[PDB]
Amino acid sequence: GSSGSSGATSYMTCSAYQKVQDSEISFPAGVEVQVLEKQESGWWYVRFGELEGWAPSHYLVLDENEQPDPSGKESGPSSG
Protein backbone atom coordinates (compact mmCIF):
# COMPACT_ATOMS: atom_id res chain seq x y z
CA GLY A 1 0.00 0.00 0.00
CA SER A 2 1.28 3.42 1.03
CA SER A 3 2.22 4.57 4.53
CA GLY A 4 1.51 8.29 4.61
CA SER A 5 -0.06 9.13 7.96
CA SER A 6 0.94 10.08 11.51
CA GLY A 7 -0.85 7.03 12.87
CA ALA A 8 -4.28 8.39 13.76
CA THR A 9 -7.77 7.01 14.37
CA SER A 10 -11.12 8.41 13.23
CA TYR A 11 -13.99 8.35 15.73
CA MET A 12 -17.74 8.92 15.46
CA THR A 13 -19.42 11.67 17.49
CA CYS A 14 -22.56 10.51 19.30
CA SER A 15 -23.04 13.61 21.46
CA ALA A 16 -22.79 17.30 20.60
CA TYR A 17 -19.71 18.61 22.41
CA GLN A 18 -19.33 22.26 23.42
CA LYS A 19 -15.91 23.91 23.17
CA VAL A 20 -14.76 25.63 26.35
CA GLN A 21 -11.68 27.32 24.88
CA ASP A 22 -11.16 29.23 21.63
CA SER A 23 -8.87 26.34 20.71
CA GLU A 24 -11.49 23.62 21.18
CA ILE A 25 -14.27 23.14 18.62
CA SER A 26 -17.92 22.10 18.90
CA PHE A 27 -19.35 19.50 16.52
CA PRO A 28 -22.88 18.14 15.94
CA ALA A 29 -24.05 14.65 16.90
CA GLY A 30 -23.62 12.48 13.82
CA VAL A 31 -20.27 13.32 12.25
CA GLU A 32 -16.78 11.86 11.99
CA VAL A 33 -13.55 13.29 13.42
CA GLN A 34 -9.84 12.47 13.28
CA VAL A 35 -7.94 12.13 16.56
CA LEU A 36 -4.57 13.80 16.00
CA GLU A 37 -3.19 13.74 19.54
CA LYS A 38 -4.23 12.15 22.83
CA GLN A 39 -3.89 13.43 26.40
CA GLU A 40 -3.47 11.26 29.49
CA SER A 41 -6.43 13.12 31.01
CA GLY A 42 -9.01 11.97 28.47
CA TRP A 43 -9.03 14.99 26.17
CA TRP A 44 -7.98 14.13 22.61
CA TYR A 45 -7.26 16.58 19.79
CA VAL A 46 -9.80 15.99 17.03
CA ARG A 47 -10.14 17.67 13.63
CA PHE A 48 -13.47 18.70 12.10
CA GLY A 49 -13.01 19.87 8.52
CA GLU A 50 -10.75 22.91 8.71
CA LEU A 51 -10.64 23.12 12.51
CA GLU A 52 -9.00 21.18 15.34
CA GLY A 53 -10.18 21.07 18.94
CA TRP A 54 -9.62 19.03 22.09
CA ALA A 55 -12.63 16.79 22.72
CA PRO A 56 -13.15 14.25 25.54
CA SER A 57 -12.90 10.57 24.62
CA HIS A 58 -16.24 10.28 26.44
CA TYR A 59 -18.17 11.99 23.64
CA LEU A 60 -16.31 9.93 21.04
CA VAL A 61 -17.25 6.31 20.36
CA LEU A 62 -14.49 3.70 20.61
CA ASP A 63 -14.50 0.41 18.70
CA GLU A 64 -14.06 -1.92 21.68
CA ASN A 65 -14.79 -5.65 21.78
CA GLU A 66 -18.00 -6.47 23.66
CA GLN A 67 -18.87 -10.13 24.18
CA PRO A 68 -21.37 -10.53 27.05
CA ASP A 69 -21.06 -14.27 27.64
CA PRO A 70 -23.04 -16.10 30.36
CA SER A 71 -19.76 -17.71 31.40
CA GLY A 72 -21.46 -21.09 31.19
CA LYS A 73 -18.81 -23.80 31.45
CA GLU A 74 -19.63 -27.49 31.86
CA SER A 75 -17.06 -27.44 34.66
CA GLY A 76 -14.95 -24.98 36.63
CA PRO A 77 -11.32 -24.72 37.81
CA SER A 78 -10.76 -28.36 38.73
CA SER A 79 -7.89 -29.44 40.99
CA GLY A 80 -9.21 -27.19 43.74
Swiss-Prot record:
<comment type="subunit">
    <text>Interacts (via N-terminus) with CYBA. Interacts with ADAM12, ADAM15 and ADAM19. Interacts with NOXO1. Interacts (via SH3 domains) with NOXA1. Interacts with FASLG. Interacts (via PX domain) with RAB40B (GTP-bound); interaction promotes invadopodia-mediated extracellular matrix degradation.</text>
</comment>
<protein>
    <recommendedName>
        <fullName>SH3 and PX domain-containing protein 2A</fullName>
    </recommendedName>
</protein>
<comment type="similarity">
    <text>Belongs to the SH3PXD2 family.</text>
</comment>
<comment type="function">
    <text>Adapter protein involved in invadopodia and podosome formation, extracellular matrix degradation and invasiveness of some cancer cells. Binds matrix metalloproteinases (ADAMs), NADPH oxidases (NOXs) and phosphoinositides. Acts as an organizer protein that allows NOX1- or NOX3-dependent reactive oxygen species (ROS) generation and ROS localization. In association with ADAM12, mediates the neurotoxic effect of amyloid-beta peptide.</text>
</comment>
<feature type="domain" description="SH3 4">
    <location>
        <begin position="8"/>
        <end position="65"/>
    </location>
</feature>
